[PDB]
Symmetry: C6
Subunit: 177 residues, 6 copies
């Protein structure tokens, strides 16, 4: 019932994103806070500086994005199961709405990533002047390069997903006409 | 036998809550106590201050809420299985009672969350004057911003669940009349 | 073959107890010993004080109670399978004996909990004077409030199980007469 | 083909032992070495004293005992599967030999437990004079009381298994005559 | 439909690589950063030196390589499932393209491994002069020999995979002619 | 198609080895490096001494041995599946070659174990004079006795496997004649 190009490629990219996120969360981001250390004797400086520079981790943002993108499909599948229960083209329009919602969810999460972390690259040293840290202190980020590489992978996959969703919408519209 | 709107949407929101809780418990709240540090030399100040400011963690409250909400459905399913065994509209009234009980459980857990943690936001610094901490000491909370974001997500999902349960009850009453 | 009220409610409460124990063991009681600290310079004081005040953890007692309660049912199921193998009301009396044994196991574990930990509430500070700790030292318990809440939940569930088992026995006796 | 009393009771006790061992290994014995501390400034004293007083942990001995007891049954099942393949009372004698081997394995492991750890109870303080510890030093054992309780449980279960195996052998001999 | 030699040998080598990577990631590379220590009093020297000498771990590179190699096959299987859905030699050419893409992915990952880590062997001591480390400091790598052995295993397996893919392409071309 | 004695006994011993390795890896060898401490103030001495005395852990060697022994059987099973696909005594000779390869893999791993760790027993104290450790320092090995016991178990099982493989080859040759 769905288009040929859409489902297969979207599922493959989604599985790739899930695998990459699993690897990165299991390994790369495990000690992002425990090994985060600042050059100071001020108690509590490490925690406040980490909170200031990492309001929410990249892994958590990616997990939330994947969940939000998935629940359209779960809702559509539940509605299809309910239709089957009733049995014992509004479905097409519902599928279009779900695809559109997935596209907006991806775009919103990309914009949030841009707002929170301008730039894909992660730096080794950050300057933190948040209370109670006196003046400005230097803090050091765990595995900036590996995190940058995984961030690039996730952003490229998300952009590919966005383009694929747009192409799927265009193809479905052409099918309608 | 049940209403069209209710089961699908409630199940989707419940699965979303489960996924969010799994992510947050696995990652965000893991080091809520180990990295909780106060600015003092008093032994035992950290533990008593953490206990005073976090009588029970947000993750544990959400887990208890999900279990309490779930066991109505488990009890109804067990009763249905027992009815099937007997085979080898009291069921409708039992379903209404279970939905009502789920609604009250959600409302009670929301009220408990309001009582224990007034306000969704978590602060970086807390003032603790609990024995044996001398005078008032400053203590620093791990990942206040990420915890605030996840708390907002869970509260919004719980409110949506409450509204959906109320709408389901109203729809079932309209069906009765 | 069994009573209507008994099996469903007992299974629901048992599953609730299992879920609560899983959550508490995974989260609440993980650092009960590592974060247990006393105010002293005496080596080995922490370990002996923890052993004196926690001969066996609440989680371990609950796990042992659940296993002991379960093995009646496992033995009855194995005997039923053996009867099926023989095929290729002594069963009723065996079921009554198993229910009675479960009731006594619950009562004995409740009495043991009363003996070891008089009172549901857990205190923040304990006074320990066990060798080699000099005079009396103060030791601080991790998460007393959350542990108290979970203890209350488990005790209420166990009491409900005891009452349900007694009611099941009475109903079965009435069926006999 | 087997006796009525034997298989069911032996399987129930074996499952009980497995559950108890799982709980104890997951929880009780996790920090047996990390929290093992001696009252000395000598480097390496903790490790040598722990090795001297715990050549092999109770959990590891129980795991080895369970594996050794199990592999008779696994070998018998594999031989039965091979007989089925051949199809596409030597079996009785093989079953007797397997039961006898299980009985000797249980007895040997009980004797090893007696040799290594005379007495079920675990003490809080041990006196260690192993090189390079100077003179005699005091070392403190983690959770002696809980370990003693679990040791008592495992020893009682093992003794019940031994008695059950002996009774099964006697019953099978009576069947032969 | 596929060649005799290719699928079986490629699957066996892929499973071998997966098993080796699982073992190494679980055990060898767990403490690559936590036990990475430099001989200095400069705060943050350890983290920057580890980032400089390990931009991305060997385990993460191998995981990414395996995922990238796998997704060709997953995409081909999804396309085959879509063809089956349509049912309710373009496939040959698609299989050739997927095999070619796997070969290039293996070659690119081998070249990346050569660029990042010239030489299979890992050294015990590295010289790090990255800010803020003053002058040049010595840092010590955890388990260089075991990591070297596992690196040799993975590189040999990857080379065997490359040769097997080339042979499969040649055999398929010969089949075409 | 295979011999009666071979498959059953080899599978039983292989499963026993897998279980023992799982237990030992989960428990005994977990802190082989973290608790490895030398008597010195030299930074990096612990890591270089551990690398010098443990180039690769016993658990990792056993895991590699089991994987290498297994992949013959996996390759043979894959070839059998391919033969089944073709359907939709070269197999005997392939089975002999696989058994021979397993025997050589076991022998080679035994020889490697002899080379790396002469003697089954593990000592408490080792003398390390590897740079940058000044002169000779004493280092202490975690759980030498338990590791020795598990090493003896694994070596005995491996020797039994070697003898069983040789006997299987002899029996198959006798079958050929």
């Amino acid at each position: 019932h769905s288009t040929a190009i859409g489902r297969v490629w979207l599922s493959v990219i989604f599985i790739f994103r899930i695998m990459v996120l699993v690897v990165a969360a299991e390994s790369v981001w495990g000690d992002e806070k425990s090994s985060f250390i600042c050059n100071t004797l001020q108690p509590g400086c490490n925690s406040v500086c980490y909170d200031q520079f990492f309001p929410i981790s990249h892994v958590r943002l990616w997990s939330l994005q994947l969940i939000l993108v998935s629940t359209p499909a779960l809702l559509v599948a539940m509605h299809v199961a309910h239709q089957q229960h009733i049995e014992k083209g509004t479905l097409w329009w519902t599928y279009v709405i779900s695809v559109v919602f997935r596209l907006l969810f991806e775009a919103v999460f990309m914009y949030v990533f841009y707002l929170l972390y301008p730039g894909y690259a992660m730096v080794r040293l950050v300057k933190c002047d948040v209370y109670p840290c006196p003046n400005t202190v230097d803090c050091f980020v765990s595995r900036p390069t590996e995190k940058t590489v995984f961030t690039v992978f996730m952003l490229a996959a998300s952009g590919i997903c966005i383009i694929l969703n747009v192409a799927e919408v265009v193809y479905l519209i052409i099918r309608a006409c």
